[PDB]
UniProtKB/Swiss-Prot annotation:
Coiled coil: none annotated. This is Inositol 1,4,5-trisphosphate-gated calcium channel ITPR1. It comes from the Eukaryota. Inositol 1,4,5-trisphosphate-gated calcium channel that, upon inositol 1,4,5-trisphosphate binding, mediates calcium release from the endoplasmic reticulum (ER). Undergoes conformational changes upon ligand binding, suggesting structural flexibility that allows the channel to switch from a closed state, capable of interacting with its ligands such as 1,4,5-trisphosphate and calcium, to an open state, capable of transferring calcium ions across the ER membrane. Cytoplasmic calcium released from the ER triggers apoptosis by the activation of CAMK2 complex. It is found in: Endoplasmic reticulum membrane; Cytoplasmic vesicle, Secretory vesicle membrane; Cytoplasm, Perinuclear region. Homotetramer. Homodimer. Interacts with ERP44 in a pH-, redox state- and calcium-dependent manner which results in the inhibition the calcium channel activity. The strength of this interaction inversely correlates with calcium concentration. Part of cGMP kinase signaling complex at least composed of ACTA2/alpha-actin, CNN1/calponin H1, PLN/phospholamban, PRKG1 and ITPR1. Interacts with IRAG1. Interacts with CABP1 (via N-terminus). Interacts with TESPA1. 1D-myo-inositol 1,4,5-trisphosphate binds at residues 252, 451, 454, 488-489. It comes from Rattus norvegicus (Rat). The ITPR1 structure has a large solenoid CY assembly built around the central helical bundle made of the C-terminal domains from four ITPR1 subunits. The solenoid scaffold includes domains responsible for binding of ligands and regulatory proteins and is connected via an allosteric nexus at the cytosolic-membrane interface to the transmembrane channel assembly. Six transmembrane helices from each subunit form the central ion-conduction pore. Polyubiquitinated. Polyubiquitination targets ITPR1 for proteasomal degradation. Approximately 40% of the ITPR1-associated ubiquitin is monoubiquitin, and polyubiquitins are both 'Lys-48'- and 'Lys-63'-linked. Phosphorylation by cAMP kinase (PKA) enhances calcium release. Phosphorylation by PKA increases the interaction with inositol 1,4,5-trisphosphate and decreases the interaction with AHCYL1. A lipid is attached at residue 50 (S-palmitoyl cysteine).
Length: 501
């Protein structure tokens, strides 16, 4: 099979350091290669971080100029609409290439899915761990440091050959200089990370295909798509959480959308590659714990830690529009069959939090008999909100990591700049935006973003940031809490007791 504009796929390094390209959550623009995190036959855990969309060469000349600045211009109004009309033109053209095969010697732009940001090689900036390599970042806008020559690796495959799935390449920057080097230099802060960069080298990149543009379309069920699972009859979402230090699979008693109810669809494939549909098999990986949904004891819903085993494999049966010929599933209600143990899903009236009054945890098992009402809705989850989530839980630990340092000792000069800048960015988030963005300053708030703060401990870190310049940051903590709190009793109260505690 060939590679085509709009395919999603991972990138694994070869030679000096075989690794899978990855990134540090959302706040950081750093690119990394964790060598002993996983290999090709057994992928690293949070694999949704290693995927890229293939985009064609973007027309960046007009947008590049617009950003040039410390200056005054009244026609910035013209220039910005000139960059925007170029920006959509780029969109239209790149979308007209959906389906075209990219051959060797083309120029392409790697797009990092999780972040919705491009690969970016800064010819003016040398990499921070490798003395002689140009720095590489993740720029949402992109630029000439996003243009990449795809050059053949084995003389076997010539230039102007069609680049075939599983081929090794040289991802050479067009003007920015030398090939993407998977360096052999380890980051201080990070145990499992070797960094990447642009310097003369012999690093070869293998391309493993996740999904073809052909399957990239919606709202058809998809390989890596994230979903919420809603029991129609029961009116409770399938969540998964630790109760009394134990991972439980249960219903929680559409308005209330938790963060521990987030399932990452997988469709089973011979290779570790990513609709599929009715005649297909699946597993379900939680977003909090890498844990997998499985049935093992007639049986019950356990949370197995990895998806290498049959017990974690289910398969979907449609209804009431059944029997359903094999075809892409379309965000519709299904009955779930465990081919492995041979039973259908059946919820229960049995609680897990047995002592708690009005218990919020209904246990679920599996019974052989089919149930007319016993079917869930595969309820889709916007990728934008998923980003928000990982951005949110991602920044949580940053605060969590940094607050514990003021706790014991003090904070370094550079360590401050981050939280100072990060905090203000967390406001644009909670205020909502953005595109200066003064309108976004005036902009209304997201209750759904507010949902997150207490849910991902964001609030809990500001309070725990008060343990011990600081006149600005300690002062700057004040914008956020209030921004979060309004119009929401739940937060207003949560914070109220937190200030009381």
């Amino acid at each position: 099979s060939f590679l085509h504009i709009g395919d999603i796929c991972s990138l694994y390094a070869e030679g000096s350091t075989n690794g899978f390209i990855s990134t540090l959550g959302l706040v950081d623009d750093r690119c990394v290669v964790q060598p002993e995190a996983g290999d090709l036959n057994n992928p690293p855990k949070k694999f949704r971080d290693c995927l890229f969309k293939l985009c064609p060469m973007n027309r960046y000349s007009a947008q590049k100029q617009f950003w040039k600045a410390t200056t005054d211009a009244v026609l910035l109004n013209k220039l910005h609409h000139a960059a925007d009309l170029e920006k959509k033109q780029n969109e239209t053209e790149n979308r007209k290439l959906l389906g075209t095969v990219i051959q060797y010697g083309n120029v392409i732009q790697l797009l990092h899915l999780k972040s919705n940001k491009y690969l970016t090689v800064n010819k003016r900036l040398p990499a921070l761990l490798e003395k002689n390599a140009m720095r590489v970042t993740l720029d949402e806008a992109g630029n000439e440091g996003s243009w990449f020559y795809i050059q053949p690796f084995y003389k076997l495959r010539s230039i102007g050959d069609s680049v075939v799935i599983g081929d090794k390449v040289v991802l050479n920057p067009v003007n920015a200089g030398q090939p993407l080097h998977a360096s052999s230099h380890q980051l201080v802060d990070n145990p499992g990370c070797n960094e990447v960069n642009s310097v003369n080298c012999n690093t070869s990149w293998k391309i493993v295909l996740f999904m073809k543009w052909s399957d990239n379309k919606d709202d058809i069920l998809k390989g890596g798509d994230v979903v919420r699972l809603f029991h129609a009859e029961q009116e409770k979402f399938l969540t998964c959480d630790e109760h009394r230090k134990k991972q439980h699979v249960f219903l929680r008693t559409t308005s209330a959308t938790s963060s521990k109810a987030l399932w990452e669809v997988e469709v089973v494939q011979h290779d570790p590659c990513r609709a599929g549909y009715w005649n297909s098999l699946f597993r379900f990986k939680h977003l909090a714990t890498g844990h997998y949904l499985a049935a093992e004891v007639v049986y019950s819903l356990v949370s197995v830690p990895e998806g290498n085993d049959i017990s974690s494999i289910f398969e979907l049966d449609p209804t009431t529009l059944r029997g359903g010929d094999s075809l892409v599933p379309r965000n519709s209600y299904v009955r779930l069959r465990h081919l492995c143990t041979n039973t259908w899903v059946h919820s229960t009236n049995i609680p897990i939090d047995k002592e708690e009054e009005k218990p919020v945890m209904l246990k679920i098992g599996t019974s052989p008999l089919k149930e007319d009402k016993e079917a869930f809705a595969i309820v889709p989850v916007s990728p934008a909100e998923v980003r928000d989530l990982d951005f949110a839980n991602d920044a949580s630990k940053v605060l969590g990591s940094i607050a514990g340092k003021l706790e014991k000792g003090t904070i370094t000069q550079n360590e401050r700049r981050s939280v100072t800048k990060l905090l203000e960015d967390l406001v644009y988030f909670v205020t909502g935006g953005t595109n200066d963005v003064l309108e976004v300053v005036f902009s209304k708030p997201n209750r759904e973003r507010q949902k997150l703060m207490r849910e991902q401990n964001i609030l809990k870190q500001i309070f725990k940031l008060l343990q011990a310049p600081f006149r600005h940051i300690c002062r700057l903590c004040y914008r956020v809490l209030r921004h979060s709190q309004q119009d929401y009793r739940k937060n207003q109260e949560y914070i109220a007791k937190q200030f009381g505690f």
